[PDB]
Design a protein around this nucleic acid. Structure first.
Ligand SMILES: [Mg+2]
Ligand SMILES: [Mg+2]
Ligand SMILES: [Mg+2]
Ligand SMILES: [Mg+2]
Ligand SMILES: [Mg+2]
Ligand SMILES: [Mg+2]
Ligand SMILES: [Mg+2]
Ligand SMILES: [Mg+2]
Ligand SMILES: [Mg+2]
Ligand SMILES: [Mg+2]
Ligand SMILES: [Mg+2]
Ligand SMILES: [Mg+2]
Ligand SMILES: [Mg+2]
Ligand SMILES: [Mg+2]
Ligand SMILES: [Mg+2]
Ligand SMILES: [Mg+2]
Ligand SMILES: [Mg+2]
Ligand SMILES: [Mg+2]
Ligand SMILES: [Mg+2]
Ligand SMILES: [Mg+2]
Ligand SMILES: [Mg+2]
Ligand SMILES: [Mg+2]
Ligand SMILES: [Mg+2]
Ligand SMILES: [Mg+2]
Ligand SMILES: [Mg+2]
Ligand SMILES: [Mg+2]
Ligand SMILES: [Mg+2]
Ligand SMILES: [Mg+2]
Ligand SMILES: [Mg+2]
Ligand SMILES: [Mg+2]
Ligand SMILES: [Mg+2]
Ligand SMILES: [Mg+2]
Ligand SMILES: [Mg+2]
Ligand SMILES: [Mg+2]
Lengths: 113, 127, 47, 57, 117
RNA sequence: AAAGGUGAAAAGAACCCCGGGAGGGGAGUGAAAGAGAACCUGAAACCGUGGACUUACAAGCAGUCAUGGCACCUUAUGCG
RNA sequence: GCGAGAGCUAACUUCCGUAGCCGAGAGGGAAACAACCCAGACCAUCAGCUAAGGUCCCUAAAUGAUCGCUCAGUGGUUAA
RNA sequence: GUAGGGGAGCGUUCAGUCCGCGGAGAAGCCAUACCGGAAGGAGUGGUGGAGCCGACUGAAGUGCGGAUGCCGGCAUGAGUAACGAUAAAAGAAGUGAGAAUCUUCUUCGCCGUAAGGACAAGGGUUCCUGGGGAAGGGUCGUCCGCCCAGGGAAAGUCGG
């Protein structure tokens, strides 16, 4: 069955609107607390977005401008963070499994830079 | 002794290691499910296991294990670093019945079971 | 769909009330034959 | 349509059904720093220690 | 004056439920199934009294048949030559002799055969 | 419609303990708290903890009746 | 079962007659089986003889005795 | 031995009467291997807390497994089905004993002749402030249209 991704019991338009707001904050604040899954969903998409931003050219900034809608944040990853990330080939994120919770009873996680 | 009345006069009941969650809003069988892991285990163990059992009835159950340990150490002058779960069980409370409407005209008695959760702590030594 | 009971204050009272229930013989009769059964609820006037 | 059960079931079977519902016990360990108890591969919840510190005390 | 059951029924009932033990499921615990189970149990008691009288007789028999055959005799022939020499032994006893008392059974055999020919 | 009962008397439980609580464990009152306010007895169905003897090649109205095993000994060491 | 009628010398058929049985009948036998063959259970017995029906093992009791038949598994399902 | 007729009795209450017991403990309940031909009835042990056994006689709402019986309780089905529109949610911040659900923030998604706004009929304090969390909430709740307390409604011209 070589397929690949998560449907995360949302549609497909949703799926995107999510990992775009989630990338938006992970970039907006170094780490986030969120479901372990939705995290292992947010890892390689933020990561790839790092590799777009890591480039300088105006293009890369409109390329980012598509997924990450807020200027301040764009500007942050473009100007501030991505450059900082120069000499490192990958692994711009990491994942931590905390524990449970009351209502849903689901495992939980911190995903950080 | 002679009379039952005389025994009543003389002795009094002391409850060693025992405490009771009365009238707790949770179904017996559920809560038993947590509690089946506590039983007969190093009482602190029970405090730990009950931090990582992810069921809802973890917490009222733990609450009653501190009560027991409490009552066992204080009220009964026991030995913390050798205290354990001699007994553990739960039985039914007065179950809490209310109506739910259903398809067409029909109705329904839906029962919100209560629980009498109860643990007895004790001293465990081999010789 | 739409239901039997669509309240109407003026209807309610002009239909079941007390001036109404006394206006007729069989309503006097309803009255005292209620009173005897110790109704607090004498009449929709008493709502 | 509308299948129901034929006969009331016994205490005996019924409790043979339950034969598995038995909860599995969190397999736990003690957490090199703060010293409460951590779940393997997760953060030791008291201090916040995965190897240095993360979530805070 | 009115007279509730008050007590009597619980009495009757317990009587049954105390007869009623060892019984598997509901049988040992609910009245109706209990008393019931016991109706049939009645049937089985009566018949099986006379019955065991049969069964034991069978048992004694097969043991004797054995005995006879252990030398060269048939049951029927042994027992018949033990009717012939008039040796009016119960057969329960004959089993006993046969299985717990060897050389005695031996002699009783030699006897039956003698009286047979 | 279903609805009744602490105690002799409120002497209705100051006060310490685990908990936000609920609830309980002491204490103290009482004769008794084996009456503590879900407060007289507390049957049965029904749910559980512990213990004895048992049960994973077996076919069953669940009993009967015969024998062996194991266990127990207050109308009870034999007809158990 | 024996007598007859209606039937198709069909029926777990129906309508009379007649004997027994079940109904209101347990017990043994016919594998199983209200009716059939033996037989009418006042209780007890770890006592004996028989009935119908049986006696290689299941399953009590002669793998009996002598004069034979069939070789077809007839026995263990029908006819011109 | 079925329908049926006959014979002798067991238990329940109320009643007359006698024997008589009971806070060193009544009835009722619980256990058991004793007795009687049976309905039944005794011994002892544990319960209970204030009434009761026995004999004789009288009178009955006088003995329940059934009636798809009536009332009530608790089981099965089952930790199953479902949690009430497929308009959709994320991260941070805060509070608390406890938060996926309550309060801020920044976004996202849906309605937009409505899923906005104003009336009438009906409802009746559901409005506002401060508080609470048993139960109502289809989960959770620190929250609420639920609980508590206190406030709020003003007409010569609107409406009668
Ligand atoms: Mg889902
Ligand atoms: Mg779309
Ligand atoms: Mg005292
Ligand atoms: Mg409706
Ligand atoms: Mg015989
Ligand atoms: Mg308290
Ligand atoms: Mg057991
Ligand atoms: Mg085999
Ligand atoms: Mg086996
Ligand atoms: Mg006919
Ligand atoms: Mg008849
Ligand atoms: Mg017969
Ligand atoms: Mg027969
Ligand atoms: Mg037979
Ligand atoms: Mg027949
Ligand atoms: Mg013969
Ligand atoms: Mg044989
Ligand atoms: Mg009297
Ligand atoms: Mg009385
Ligand atoms: Mg009934
Ligand atoms: Mg039916
Ligand atoms: Mg499941
Ligand atoms: Mg199912
Ligand atoms: Mg399923
Ligand atoms: Mg489902
Ligand atoms: Mg919904
Ligand atoms: Mg959804
Ligand atoms: Mg802020
Ligand atoms: Mg805080
Ligand atoms: Mg929500
Ligand atoms: Mg509107
Ligand atoms: Mg409000
Ligand atoms: Mg709730
Ligand atoms: Mg608060």
């Amino acid at each position: 069955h070589g397929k690949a991704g998560r449907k995360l019991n949302r549609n497909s338009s949703a799926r995107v609107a999510l990992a775009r707001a989630q990338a938006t904050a992970l970039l907006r604040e170094g780490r986030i607390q969120t479901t372990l899954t939705k995290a292992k969903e947010l890892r390689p998409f933020v990561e790839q977005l790092i590799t777009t931003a890591k480039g300088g050219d105006l293009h890369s900034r409109r390329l980012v401008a598509q997924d990450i809608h807020d200027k301040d944040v764009v500007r942050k990853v473009m100007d501030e963070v991505a450059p900082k990330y120069a000499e490192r080939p990958g692994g711009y994120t990491r994942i931590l499994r905390v524990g449970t919770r009351r209502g849903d009873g689901v495992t939980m996680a911190l995903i950080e830079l | 002794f002679r009379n039952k009345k005389q025994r009543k006069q003389q002795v009094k009941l002391r409850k060693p290691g025992f405490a009771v969650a009365k009238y707790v809003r949770m179904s017996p069988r559920k809560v038993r499910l947590v509690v089946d892991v506590i039983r007969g285990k190093s009482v602190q163990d029970a405090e730990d296991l009950l931090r990582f059992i992810p069921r809802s009835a973890s917490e009222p159950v733990a609450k009653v294990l501190n009560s027991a340990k409490a009552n066992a150490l204080h009220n009964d002058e026991m030995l913390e670093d050798r205290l354990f779960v001699k007994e553990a069980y739960v039985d039914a409370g007065p179950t809490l019945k209310r109506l739910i409407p259903r398809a067409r005209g029909s109705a329904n008695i839906i029962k919100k079971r209560t629980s009498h959760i109860t643990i007895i702590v004790a001293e465990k030594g081999n010789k | 769909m739409k239901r039997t009971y669509q309240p109407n204050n003026r209807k309610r009272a002009k239909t079941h009330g007390f001036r109404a229930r006394m206006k007729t013989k069989s309503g006097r009769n309803i009255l005292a034959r209620r009173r005897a059964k110790g109704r607090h609820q004498l009449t929709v006037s008493d709502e | 349509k509308h299948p129901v059960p034929k006969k009331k079931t016994s205490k005996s079977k019924r409790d043979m059904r339950r034969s598995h519902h038995a909860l599995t016990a969190p397999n736990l360990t003690e957490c090199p720093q703060c010293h409460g108890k951590k779940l393997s591969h997760h953060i030791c919840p008291n201090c916040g220690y995965y190897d240095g510190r993360q979530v805070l005390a | 004056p009115r007279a509730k059951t008050g007590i009597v029924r619980r009495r009757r009932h317990k009587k049954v439920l105390k007869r009623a033990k060892g019984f598997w499921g509901s049988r040992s615990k609910q009245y109706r199934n209990a008393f019931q189970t016991l109706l049939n149990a009645a049937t089985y008691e009566y018949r099986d009294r006379r019955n065991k009288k049969r069964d034991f007789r069978r048992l004694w028999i097969q043991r004797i048949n054995a005995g006879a055959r252990l030398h060269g005799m048939n049951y029927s022939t042994f027992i018949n030559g033990l009717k012939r020499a008039n040796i009016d032994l119960n057969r329960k006893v004959l089993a006993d002799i046969a299985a717990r008392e060897p050389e005695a059974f031996k002699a009783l055999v030699d006897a039956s055969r003698n009286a047979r020919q």
